[PDB]
Amino acid sequence: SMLDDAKARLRKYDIGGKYSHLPYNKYSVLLPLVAKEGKLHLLFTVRSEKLRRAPGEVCFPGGKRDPTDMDDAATALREAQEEVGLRPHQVEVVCCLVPCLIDTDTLITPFVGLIDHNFQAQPNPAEVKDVFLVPLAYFLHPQVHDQINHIFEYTNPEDGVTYQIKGMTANLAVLVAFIILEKKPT
Numbered sequence: 001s002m003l004d005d006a007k008a009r010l011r012k013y014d015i016g017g018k019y020s021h022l023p024y025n026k027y028s029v030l031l032p033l034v035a036k037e038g039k040l041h042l043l044f045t046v047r048s049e050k051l052r053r054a055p056g057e058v059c060f061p062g063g064k065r066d067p068t069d070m071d072d073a074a075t076a077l078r079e080a081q082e083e084v085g086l087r088p089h090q091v092e093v094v095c096c097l098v099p100c101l102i103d104t105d106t107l108i109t110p111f112v113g114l115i116d117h118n119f120q121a122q123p124n125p126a127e128v129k130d131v132f133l134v135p136l137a138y139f140l141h142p143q144v145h146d147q148i149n150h151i152f153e154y155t156n157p158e159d160g161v162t163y164q165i166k167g168m169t170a171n172l173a174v175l176v177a178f179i180i181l182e183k184k185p186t
């Protein structure tokens with residue numbers, strides 16, 4: 001099946017907890033996969049314009065580890081629950097992808113999660129301005145704009161709204177698209 005095939009592909013790239021104890025400032029992100037209309041999608045958030053860091057930017061759910069978290073996956077799930085109302089029974093964490101080093105002292109660990117079909121996001125408006133889906137296949141043939149660094153523009157066909165996806169968020173989306181969609185019979 002589509003979902004069993006996606007999980008089997010993802011597991012081959014799992015690094016597990018290999019980098020998880022290193023003494024960094026630690027953040028986790030959840031890369032949330034949603035199956036709709038017979039295709040996989042990624043779920044994105046738009047950060048509230050009120051936030052001090054990166055207001056209005058497209059990002060994955062997640063945030064800073066706190067002492068309550070049993071592990072880095074727990075960080076991602078706790079923060080996703082706060083931000084978009086995703087409950088832990090609604091997400092299956094499949095793997096841990098390559099961590100992202102930034103600022104010399106920070107390590108961001110991405111987890112891919114399969115999201116229940118009955119989940120409906122409840123954006124916390126103090127943190128999240130918007131939530132939207134992009135088909136995973138978009139990231140194989142994105143609409144690229146050069147600002148010199150590459151920005152993706154995705155237009156939702158439901159309403160005509162265009163979102164800019166860039167940086168680490170764009171890079172991780174492409175990675176997941178490659179892992180899941182490369183080398184597949186039609």
Ligand SMILES: *CC(=O)N1CCC[C@H]1c1cccc(CC(=O)Nc2cccc(Cl)c2)c1
Nearest residue numbers: 027045047054057058059060061062063127
């Ligand atoms: C867009 C993005 O990936 N960002 C913006 C800030 C730096 C980077 C980032 C680093 C580490 C963790 C996260 C996850 C995150 O904080 N996500 C998130 C989304 C929407 C609202 C809130 Cl409060 C938080 C992002």
